[PDB]
């Protein structure tokens, strides 16, 4: 147990934003998802609360993690582990003190864990344009996201892989509904609407004297959980620069093979996916300007100002990439 | 070619509302869909307009029809053939004179043809509650409707079953989009919204001096096509009583086995599906009062008054079933 | 003063809906507008209330009437006189008891009087398509309606033609605004919006215990006056059949010469304007179904049920024309 | 061809924001509009694309420019030339890459060119209050803007002045509609609504990965073109201070004669138009604070951040004028 | 115990719509409220469910009933008893099966019981116009309704008059809130808004397969309870004609003395309150047309079709009063 | 008349935002309300415009001021005087130039003057929870606000205390309505709705060329007056820091005795009212973040940018208090 001590030391920052997931990925023999999921369940005492057999949890996590493609640069088990950990941190934000039930917390975390499982490394648009079997199956509607959900739920049926075995029938139904609602919201084509509803909610925001939010009905809470996992899924630009840059390299490394795939097919090369005409820096600045910042700014509003540091980091990272943009 | 003359004589009423599809079903050796689809394509000169190889058309129709379950009382090839023929008639309504392009007409008719293919005879709710593989796959969202589309499109890939082989790439894309949008609208859980948008469209209705509707953009036209196939799908109570009654018998015959299936499962017997406590007459009156009449009344408004007779027949049939309701 | 007694006897029905304006037209030597306007001003004591010199009133009315084309079958001084009289009757509806100020009443009546002055007998669309100087002038926007207002106001500047000479500067400004707002609303291309706002107002309708409407702000009152003159302008189908039919003959007599004009120009013959392919009866049924009935039904709602008889007459006249529709 | 070289050298900055239009005005013998319009048409290859006879173009431009009053300090051919050039630059903004068709581009530029033709040097309000023939004509509604359109279109009818002679009938119709919609939007009384719709469009803003806007329907594109020409028309405070100040001098020089005109009429002197009580500096700061900055800030958002420099210049110029405000 | 048997026989119809409350009023020595409230509490087992001391209940009911003025023709203990009984019946409608908790049922019934207590026989408007101490107190806002609530709650404080003595502190708080919300909704000036929200709720209506409504949150349920007691309060025209007519006589008998009071004050006589110019028949037809029918029609929709008979009766009674309208 | 000169010198800043009301309170022998009200009435020539007997005005002001509790740290005559003066300044904002009638101006100022009269120093919630007679009276609805109105109007009835004695009956009615509507809007529980309507009004904002707002109907104007007095009532954090801090000390000094009162009652100590656990600085930052800034930001928008300085001051004061927040 040499470096196993270093691993355990790294996992001590599970509640901190910039957790170094990449190191944990190595120190765990490529099991960041299993490791992090397990430690978060311990941390949240979910194992006890829902009577989840530890052996069952690990058996499931192992299978789930196995279904994340190793030959995929970005959408893999490290990404999954990252979104899980980020959702974990966001759930603990002060403004959301005791707002969510244990079942809702469980759903959000489980949803994060499976949100991209079995991702092939190509976009929904690619799958649609190449007339993939997956697109045929899902009628070009949230092709990947639907698939992720199917796979994640399917794996629960195997050998004591069913970590939810001891939840009441009603609880199992709720969890399935919430998980489906959250993961389907990670589809980027739903970003605008999601953000719109979030803004509508930031106004008409009901807060208790202390500072905690007041979410009465389900549709209000599920909306927050959706945007939360969405923020977690799009949190790379808000993490410490060293991490962010690694992610950017991975996502570009994945976009290019798709562009290559498209060049072979004779297809119109998707934007950013063109190896010979990419502006990595500009793309990041744009990605932040059009998607990430608008979203996080709104989130920062809702949980004001618990997200103030994250927002600041985002804006700093934008300037860094901005400066890196070639001037010629 | 003895009764083959009678069949050809029956098909002469392909443009009339009360076509006797059940007779055509027999006279064709249980090939009403293939027969009616083919005659409507001839009638509309679609074979020529889209260069569809006749042999290819029949090959596809045969396969498609084969995928409609024979042991299913209502959701089968006769129902499919009926919705196709009804859509065909509705498309020819005066108020919609030259409003739709040939591609849109093609899509609506093709959509009708595959709208319920491979239907198992149980409801989406049943599939969801019994944790079916199909519901797991489609995340309890338009489970059946999604499946119908997948199967119908999949069959096109086989042996010269691709009747669309000679459409431009752009046309193939539009047709697929429209077909998906139309079939997903046949999901009954979307009825209220669909009807709501239709009403919003009846007001603000733009008509030319002659009487023809003015549909400018796609979202306006696709909305009409959706409601149209939806009306066709829920057209039984508007057909001649002799036909309507046969349909009612079939739908109840199908509902009960589901109720039986549920009784075995130990599940709560769905309403109307309970063999020992059904009020067939009341159910029809209710079905007409809450769903069919509200929908057709609105449709009758949009195409006023081309649908006046259909509305009258509907109201007459309602009174007939009303009278039949036991008074004890 | 032989028949001058009959004329005075006819004018006794100035407050009744079916006034026989055509007879009054003859008995007055083609001065129905001057005659009816004068008698309504007397009737409403407007001459006193606004210190209008009787000689000035008649001088203006004469000039105004003179500017209505004699060679125009429908849009002439008899039509003007009719809309004036109808607005007069509508203003007296019980539901609008003391709702409007004398200035507003004056504006509505004056607006009616000039609403179609100097009408050339062709449609706005014709003027636009033929690149008329009038359309060039008004940028194809409410070409005729703008023109009517310009002419009607311009005539006031002449020889003691200024019947408003004794209104305060503020009153003159309000009257001009209201008149412009009402006449521009007679443009048929604004029918849908006008009707829409009227419906929105029928809901949220505030009525006093007795039954009188409650119109607080100007935009509410000007909206009612707009729709009122619009109803008056489209009141032919709601008058006694003998009158209605005469109007229908005149309007068709005017549409055809435009159609002839278009045939000469080599232009696409406008619908209904085609002498060799008109279905006068069908056109009326359509006109009532798509425009008149929807409007009057809404108006009948707002002033419920003071307009109940008018609505009934409208529906009876629809059936009459319906029956007259050739069955071959 | 001495200074004709300097002129050609100045025109080299036709694609740059701060083009020195005033110098070009002199170097061209007071033909900045003709010169700049011609060079922009060359630059955009519109002459070729729409088969416009060069002789016809110059003939029209000459006539158009002639109809701009020489004795009017601000609303003259230099202003027209300036709005044209600014629209030209705005059209080339990165965010609007290939968003507009050539016809739409043509419309926007042509609209800018005639947007103030035959402007008398007094406001719409003045024309209305003085009961001008123009106000009588247009019923106090966008009096000037309507007139500009009428004159600009009328001039096309003359001697090979019809630069649009080779556009299909459909194109001519679209161009006319767009031109009318754009110029009528230059009416300042429509600023609040226009800005409101623009803000509504900045949210719900659909952008492609690269950064280009996505405008699907016409009403979306015409709305952008409207606000664009409106921005161009109110672009003075955003230009280099040396230019801005010259414009401010001209506009104040024009406002005062109106104020003088009003003093003679015995009318209430309009604000800012009072020669003896004007605060030129304060007025500019106010003009920027209430109109210009709110508009440009919104525009900068829509095309973010292509307009960042323009916004900065605007804010700098505001501070300059702010400092100049007398402290006594 | 002679007629005490008849009384007990009458109370047997406590669950039926047309209960003869007037007879019960006599047979009980003018204690219809006490009698009917008690029998409804027994009927609903509320005494047990909330541990209400029977002696306490009667003590309170007696005091409450005593605070209803005997010299008031309509707004007295019989009216109170009627609204209570009607609310009781409406609560039992099939469509609202197990929708409300016992506390909510208690609140609705208690609210009905005190909804008009200590009513002086004059309108809020009268109280406002005469500068009553009550209007001064309540700032002309729901003057009477506020007063009713104050008195009804105040009486609970007396000698074992506190029938809620055994409810948890939380329950007492909820009941007070609901009661206040319901009674303040009986203010006629809030009718339009209440009806508006009810219509909005009829659309978007969520019903279970069986037919029962689905009311998730409180604001949805309290809205239904509000409209319910409002319907009960305006239920006279929906009751059997013999009853309805007696109510109409009483309400007119009360309106007139107010009209007399106003004639003495020298005040403008309120509409309908004028003894010498009333059209009792017309007033009822109007009352039904503008208030009662619109409300009940909407309610009938929400609980469709449990209220079908009530609606029919209402429409029959309208025609009766319509016919009675003098024709001279 | 020693310091009476200093007093008169202080009152010279009555039209300036940061007026030092506390000094004026001393220099006037604790009569800031009477003094400031009188000077504002002089300033606005209201005495003349409404024929208010000066002796009557002072008699009323003296009585009114007397009804503000001396033993109440915040909600007293100095607060009243402050809200009056602030409303006075806001009414004079450029953007609202001649928008309000003299009666509306009178109502707003009178409403401010009485808005908290006879305030006991405890919250509505306290009065409700302690079952106060006042809460019983007003059914827990705007308990204090209703009371303030009642007392302020009641005092007018006394000895020539009726300053409105010479207003027409109609004017008296309007003033009463507006005053009631404005004061009831000072209830903090209506803040969210009020702000919501204000935002809805900032969009769809209609402004004249010059910069002045356009408020057509009453409901629009009364809405602005409501939010105005609401802004005035919540203006402390927007005043110069020296003033703001004094107010903060007073409000906390008042909150604590309530908390003490609650500790004695054995009640749950209200937030912020707990003497032993208050974070005065944090509370202010929160108060500004959740209530004040959101409100003023919106107001600044409506009257843009007349309120720019006030907004800046608010944000500066927020940072000051933020810095003061203990870091341990
Ligand atoms: C209750 O009756 C009917 C119900 C349905 C029907 C179809 C889809 C569905 O989801 N629910 N009901 C279809 C037909 C019916 O009756 C008759 F027309 F055959
Ligand atoms: C107050 O300043 C200016 C005002 C206008 C201007 C234009 C149209 C209008 O209606 N009102 N003002 C135009 C330019 C100005 O200043 C400078 F840019 F030249
Ligand atoms: C005009 O008739 C009626 C009016 C009311 C009634 C009640 C409250 C109110 O404010 N206005 N009218 C109540 C009953 C009536 O009639 C009959 F049902 F008794
Ligand atoms: C938390 O601070 C403050 C709170 C209030 C305040 C007023 C009414 C209310 O209901 N709640 N808080 C008023 C002023 C404050 O601070 C400062 F401006 F004096
Ligand atoms: Mg202009
Ligand atoms: Zn201009
Ligand atoms: Zn009542
Ligand atoms: Zn206050």
mmCIF file with all atom_site columns, N, CA, C and O and ligand atoms in Angstrom, chain E residues 74-75 79-80 83 115-116 119 148 186 233-234, ligand 7:
data_model
loop_
_atom_site.group_PDB
_atom_site.id
_atom_site.type_symbol
_atom_site.label_atom_id
_atom_site.label_alt_id
_atom_site.label_comp_id
_atom_site.label_asym_id
_atom_site.label_entity_id
_atom_site.label_seq_id
_atom_site.pdbx_PDB_ins_code
_atom_site.Cartn_x
_atom_site.Cartn_y
_atom_site.Cartn_z
_atom_site.occupancy
_atom_site.B_iso_or_equiv
_atom_site.pdbx_formal_charge
_atom_site.auth_seq_id
_atom_site.auth_comp_id
_atom_site.auth_asym_id
_atom_site.auth_atom_id
_atom_site.pdbx_PDB_model_num
ATOM   1  N  N   . UNK E 1 74  ? -82.282 38.876 3.506  1.00 0.00 ? 74  UNK E N   1
ATOM   2  C  CA  . UNK E 1 74  ? -81.479 37.860 2.825  1.00 0.00 ? 74  UNK E CA  1
ATOM   3  C  C   . UNK E 1 74  ? -80.210 37.395 3.561  1.00 0.00 ? 74  UNK E C   1
ATOM   4  O  O   . UNK E 1 74  ? -80.045 36.205 3.855  1.00 0.00 ? 74  UNK E O   1
ATOM   5  N  N   . UNK E 1 75  ? -79.310 38.329 3.846  1.00 0.00 ? 75  UNK E N   1
ATOM   6  C  CA  . UNK E 1 75  ? -78.054 37.978 4.503  1.00 0.00 ? 75  UNK E CA  1
ATOM   7  C  C   . UNK E 1 75  ? -78.233 37.690 5.991  1.00 0.00 ? 75  UNK E C   1
ATOM   8  O  O   . UNK E 1 75  ? -77.833 38.472 6.855  1.00 0.00 ? 75  UNK E O   1
ATOM   9  N  N   . UNK E 1 79  ? -79.554 32.090 5.071  1.00 0.00 ? 79  UNK E N   1
ATOM   10 C  CA  . UNK E 1 79  ? -78.613 32.170 3.962  1.00 0.00 ? 79  UNK E CA  1
ATOM   11 C  C   . UNK E 1 79  ? -77.349 31.417 4.361  1.00 0.00 ? 79  UNK E C   1
ATOM   12 O  O   . UNK E 1 79  ? -76.829 30.590 3.595  1.00 0.00 ? 79  UNK E O   1
ATOM   13 N  N   . UNK E 1 80  ? -76.866 31.698 5.569  1.00 0.00 ? 80  UNK E N   1
ATOM   14 C  CA  . UNK E 1 80  ? -75.671 31.039 6.083  1.00 0.00 ? 80  UNK E CA  1
ATOM   15 C  C   . UNK E 1 80  ? -75.854 29.529 6.055  1.00 0.00 ? 80  UNK E C   1
ATOM   16 O  O   . UNK E 1 80  ? -75.000 28.790 5.559  1.00 0.00 ? 80  UNK E O   1
ATOM   17 N  N   . UNK E 1 83  ? -75.664 28.230 2.400  1.00 0.00 ? 83  UNK E N   1
ATOM   18 C  CA  . UNK E 1 83  ? -74.325 28.178 1.831  1.00 0.00 ? 83  UNK E CA  1
ATOM   19 C  C   . UNK E 1 83  ? -73.541 27.019 2.451  1.00 0.00 ? 83  UNK E C   1
ATOM   20 O  O   . UNK E 1 83  ? -72.759 26.347 1.768  1.00 0.00 ? 83  UNK E O   1
ATOM   21 N  N   . UNK E 1 115 ? -69.368 33.076 6.781  1.00 0.00 ? 115 UNK E N   1
ATOM   22 C  CA  . UNK E 1 115 ? -69.164 33.974 5.630  1.00 0.00 ? 115 UNK E CA  1
ATOM   23 C  C   . UNK E 1 115 ? -69.927 35.312 5.535  1.00 0.00 ? 115 UNK E C   1
ATOM   24 O  O   . UNK E 1 115 ? -69.475 36.244 4.840  1.00 0.00 ? 115 UNK E O   1
ATOM   25 N  N   . UNK E 1 116 ? -71.065 35.426 6.220  1.00 0.00 ? 116 UNK E N   1
ATOM   26 C  CA  . UNK E 1 116 ? -71.829 36.679 6.200  1.00 0.00 ? 116 UNK E CA  1
ATOM   27 C  C   . UNK E 1 116 ? -72.321 37.139 7.582  1.00 0.00 ? 116 UNK E C   1
ATOM   28 O  O   . UNK E 1 116 ? -73.171 38.030 7.674  1.00 0.00 ? 116 UNK E O   1
ATOM   29 N  N   . UNK E 1 119 ? -74.014 40.667 9.114  1.00 0.00 ? 119 UNK E N   1
ATOM   30 C  CA  . UNK E 1 119 ? -74.209 41.450 7.899  1.00 0.00 ? 119 UNK E CA  1
ATOM   31 C  C   . UNK E 1 119 ? -75.327 42.458 8.189  1.00 0.00 ? 119 UNK E C   1
ATOM   32 O  O   . UNK E 1 119 ? -76.421 42.067 8.605  1.00 0.00 ? 119 UNK E O   1
ATOM   33 N  N   . UNK E 1 148 ? -66.938 40.007 8.649  1.00 0.00 ? 148 UNK E N   1
ATOM   34 C  CA  . UNK E 1 148 ? -67.489 38.684 8.905  1.00 0.00 ? 148 UNK E CA  1
ATOM   35 C  C   . UNK E 1 148 ? -66.427 37.816 9.556  1.00 0.00 ? 148 UNK E C   1
ATOM   36 O  O   . UNK E 1 148 ? -66.666 37.221 10.594 1.00 0.00 ? 148 UNK E O   1
ATOM   37 N  N   . UNK E 1 186 ? -65.355 35.669 -1.060 1.00 0.00 ? 186 UNK E N   1
ATOM   38 C  CA  . UNK E 1 186 ? -66.793 35.778 -1.269 1.00 0.00 ? 186 UNK E CA  1
ATOM   39 C  C   . UNK E 1 186 ? -67.112 37.216 -1.611 1.00 0.00 ? 186 UNK E C   1
ATOM   40 O  O   . UNK E 1 186 ? -68.250 37.544 -1.908 1.00 0.00 ? 186 UNK E O   1
ATOM   41 N  N   . UNK E 1 233 ? -72.240 30.257 -2.433 1.00 0.00 ? 233 UNK E N   1
ATOM   42 C  CA  . UNK E 1 233 ? -72.780 31.557 -2.082 1.00 0.00 ? 233 UNK E CA  1
ATOM   43 C  C   . UNK E 1 233 ? -73.662 32.124 -3.193 1.00 0.00 ? 233 UNK E C   1
ATOM   44 O  O   . UNK E 1 233 ? -74.572 32.909 -2.924 1.00 0.00 ? 233 UNK E O   1
ATOM   45 N  N   . UNK E 1 234 ? -73.405 31.726 -4.437 1.00 0.00 ? 234 UNK E N   1
ATOM   46 C  CA  . UNK E 1 234 ? -74.198 32.209 -5.563 1.00 0.00 ? 234 UNK E CA  1
ATOM   47 C  C   . UNK E 1 234 ? -74.945 31.035 -6.177 1.00 0.00 ? 234 UNK E C   1
ATOM   48 O  O   . UNK E 1 234 ? -75.022 30.909 -7.400 1.00 0.00 ? 234 UNK E O   1
HETATM 49 ZN ZN1 . LIG G 2 .   ? -73.311 35.354 1.058  1.00 0.00 ? 7   LIG G ZN1 1
#
